[PDB]
Amino acid sequence: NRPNRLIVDEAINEDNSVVSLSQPKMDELQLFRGDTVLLKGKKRREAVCIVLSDDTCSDEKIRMNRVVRNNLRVRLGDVISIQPCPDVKYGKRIHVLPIDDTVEGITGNLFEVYLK
Amino acid sequence: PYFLEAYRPIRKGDIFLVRGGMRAVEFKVVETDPSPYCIVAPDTVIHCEGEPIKREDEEESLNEVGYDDIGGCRKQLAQIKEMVELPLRHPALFKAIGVKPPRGILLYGPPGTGKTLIARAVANETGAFFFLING
Numbered sequence A: 001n002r003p004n005r006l007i008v009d010e011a012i013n014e015d016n017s018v019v020s021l022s023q024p025k026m027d028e029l030q031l032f033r034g035d036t037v038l039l040k041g042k043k044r045r046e047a048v049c050i051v052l053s054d055d056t057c058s059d060e061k062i063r064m065n066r067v068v069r070n071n072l073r074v075r076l077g078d079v080i081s082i083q084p085c086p087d088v089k090y091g092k093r094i095h096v097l098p099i100d101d102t103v104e105g106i107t108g109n110l111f112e113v114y115l116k
Numbered sequence B: 001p002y003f004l005e006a007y008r009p010i011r012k013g014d015i016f017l018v019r020g021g022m023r024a025v026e027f028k029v030v031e032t033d034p035s036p037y038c039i040v041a042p043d044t045v046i047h048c049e050g051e052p053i054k055r056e057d058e059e060e061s062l063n064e065v066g067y068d069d070i071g072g073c074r075k076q077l078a079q080i081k082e083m084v085e086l087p088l089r090h091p092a093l094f095k096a097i098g099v100k101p102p103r104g105i106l107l108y109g110p111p112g113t114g115k116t117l118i119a120r121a122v123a124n125e126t127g128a129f130f131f132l133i134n135g
């Protein structure tokens, strides 16, 4: 019915916050190589990424990392609606927390090594 | 002949080992007048009377096997030390790395070449709990 409905393909670009589309689909949706789109998934949860281009991509599919794929409650072969979001808002305060099963050997500083 | 032409600095709290007469024997310095340590002179007198006492519960024996009893296989003993000494002496420091250790080593050779000796010596000289399984 709608040309924004897509199916999940594998990841090639090894960046976390990067999704990929093909050339005629991006020319049909009129995007650019520095835009910011939004992906709707299952369990009423969404994900924001950065859309880029790819020539090896197929017609009605989207390429994304396993991080974005698990943040949407989506597996390989599901359906995702994409929409544009020009609401470019700069952040002010970011409060994050580590997870205990992945920090059980490290202690002290984490800002300078991992996040900086 | 032990203290003669030796000038050995002894101290209260030392156990020394004397070999000879087809026997190794351990003596403990119990009492000295220049406490704690003193160099043995020809002026000294040694009162070797008294009854033999037992061992303190934490004092390990020099009858048991260390690296000194093994000869002729310096390279293989160095290779086993490079494999095993770092996951034993630093357990938790190695736990936080992300490197898997070895988990099984197979010693082989002709009968009589001292394999049980090497296993027991690498056991005792690292403080690891050593369990023995006999076939």
Ligand SMILES: Nc1ncnc2c1ncn2[C@@H]1O[C@H](COP(=O)(O)OP(=O)(O)OP(O)(O)=S)[C@@H](O)[C@H]1O
Binding pocket: B069, B070, B071, B072, B073, B110, B111, B112, B113, B114, B115, B116, B117
């Ligand atoms: N490299 C060695 N250095 C010093 N003593 C050794 C050495 N190899 C053997 N011996 C002596 O010979 C004894 C025999 O050693 P073992 O550990 O019984 O050899 P082995 O490999 O266990 O033989 P098998 O196959 O188990 S019967 C040791 O207890 C030592 O007294």
Ligand SMILES: [Mg+2]
Binding pocket: B115, B116
């Ligand atoms: Mg044996």
